[PDB]
């Protein structure tokens, strides 16, 4: 009945004044893109930075299991768009926020639905 929760562990770490996870891989792009949250190629707009999906995944970076029966990762293999203001902690952003299902944008960021 015991499971290690990294999601809470990292969130509390940040609140403790902890230095966010670094060396996320930032991609060179046109920044003219659609601005969707998770895409097959970098989609960043002017307000976003495009990162490699795997490097922004807390579970990938910490070498631990993914929180789901299949153990599937929706980051690795893809590219994630982080708002330039939040770009200092890509791992924390993807962890804390959620992707809108219908319009594919970030909830609270760029989602007009």
């Amino acid at each position: 009945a015991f499971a290690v929760d990294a999601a809470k562990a990292y969130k509390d770490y940040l609140a403790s004044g902890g230095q966010p996870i670094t060396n996320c891989v930032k991609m060179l792009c046109t920044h003219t893109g659609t601005g969707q949250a998770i895409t097959v190629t970098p989609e960043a707009n002017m307000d976003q930075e495009s990162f490699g999906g795997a490097s922004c995944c807390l579970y990938c970076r910490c070498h631990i299991d993914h929180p789901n029966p299949k153990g599937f990762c929706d980051l690795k293999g893809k590219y994630v768009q982080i708002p330039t203001t939040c770009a200092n902690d890509p791992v924390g952003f993807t962890l804390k926020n959620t992707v809108c299902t219908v319009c594919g944008m970030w909830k609270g960021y760029g989602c007009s639905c």
Binding site: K26, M27, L28, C29, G53, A54, S55
Partner: protein, 297 residues
């Protein structure tokens, strides 16, 4: 220096045709660092310019393209080069990477261990190797041809590279192989490419283009590396991050290159011609199977 707006500089043909003695490589720009865009890694910038240059060559780009990347893991634990490759390569391109040390990758599959342990059933359209031995940084001797992963790469190219396929292999002054140079003569065209961001370094990517499976040209490996060093010594390259700022044309154009299965007796000058123009790939279309050998003790 008009070369500053290019992704990098390729070794001029006239330098390839010389016969030179190997000297020490003393770069005018040695120690200097190019100014990268904000928050951009060296490996991302380096790989970007490599791909930007590869777009200018003739590369076979078939559907279900197969690309393998050796030495993709960094000391940070990530795979920056793999990320650029995945971006550059057409969507759906199967990308496998490998490294000696554990790392996190965006590739379809990742093998951890010495490259000599890596085995694949099928062949490959494109091979990329950033592999570098840190022990090479220690020079206890003259500079001679290096064994190790260089030995494996030459074997992997001859056996596992599909005809018409291409390779990009990272070399430096002290990290190089004579047979790899000789193997460049088995390609329709070849060059040593130096990225503008890394221009202060003796590093270059040996690029084979459109593998013909047989030598069209006879190349002395020791002489050619001496030629490369001579070129670098007599031609200072201005550090440039310029090409990184235009990504509009970056993605690799999908040419839908034909893939055929032919016996070696079925390959004529007509087929060899199609290969040299990057209009043909010769290999099996079967499923991709890879494995890494594990020593038990």
């Amino acid at each position: 220096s008009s070369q500053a707006w290019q992704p990098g500089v390729a070794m001029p043909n006239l330098y390839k045709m010389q016969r030179m003695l190997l000297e020490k490589c003393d770069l005018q720009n040695y120690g200097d660092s190019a100014t990268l865009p904000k928050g951009i890694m060296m490996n991302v910038a380096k790989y970007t310019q490599l791909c930007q240059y590869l777009n200018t060559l003739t590369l076979a780009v078939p559907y279900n393209m197969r690309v393998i990347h050796f030495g993709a893991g960094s000391d940070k634990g990530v795979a920056p080069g793999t990320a650029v490759l995945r971006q550059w390569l057409p969507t759906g391109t199967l990308l496998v990477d490998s490294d000696l040390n554990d790392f996190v990758s965006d590739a379809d599959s990742t093998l951890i261990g010495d490259c000599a342990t890596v085995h694949t059933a099928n062949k490959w359209d494109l091979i990329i190797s950033d592999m570098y031995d840190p022990k090479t940084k220690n020079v206890t001797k003259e500079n001679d041809s290096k064994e190790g992963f260089f030995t494996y790469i030459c074997g992997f190219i001859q056996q596992k590279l599909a005809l018409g396929g291409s390779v990009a292999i990272k070399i430096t002054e002290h990290s190089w192989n004579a047979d790899l140079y000789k193997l460049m003569g088995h390609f329709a065209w070849w060059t040593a490419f130096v990225t503008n961001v890394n221009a202060s370094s003796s590093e270059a990517f040996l690029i084979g283009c459109n593998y013909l499976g047989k030598p069209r040209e006879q190349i002395d490996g020791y002489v050619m590396h001496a030629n490369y060093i001579f070129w670098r010594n007599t031609n200072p390259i201005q550090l440039s991050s310029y090409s990184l700022f235009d990504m509009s044309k970056f993605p690799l154009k999908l040419r839908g290159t034909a893939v055929m299965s032919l016996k070696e007796g079925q390959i004529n000058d007509m087929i060899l011609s199609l290969l040299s123009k990057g209009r043909l790939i010769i290999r099996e279309n079967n499923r991709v199977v890879i494995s890494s050998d594990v020593l038990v003790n």
